[PDB]
Design a protein around this nucleic acid. Structure first.
Length: 14
RNA sequence: GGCAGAUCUGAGCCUGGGAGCUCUCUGCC
């Protein structure tokens, strides 16, 4: 999974 | 208990600014 944090672009494995 | 999805947004933190830490919501078994 992919996720963004108003600045920091993150992700969780798939 | 396990699995899946989610952040100019569901929120905060760390600097390296990610594929890290914590919380929350929804769905399924």
């Amino acid at each position: 999974a992919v996720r963004t944090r108003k600045g920091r672009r993150i992700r969780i494995x798939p």
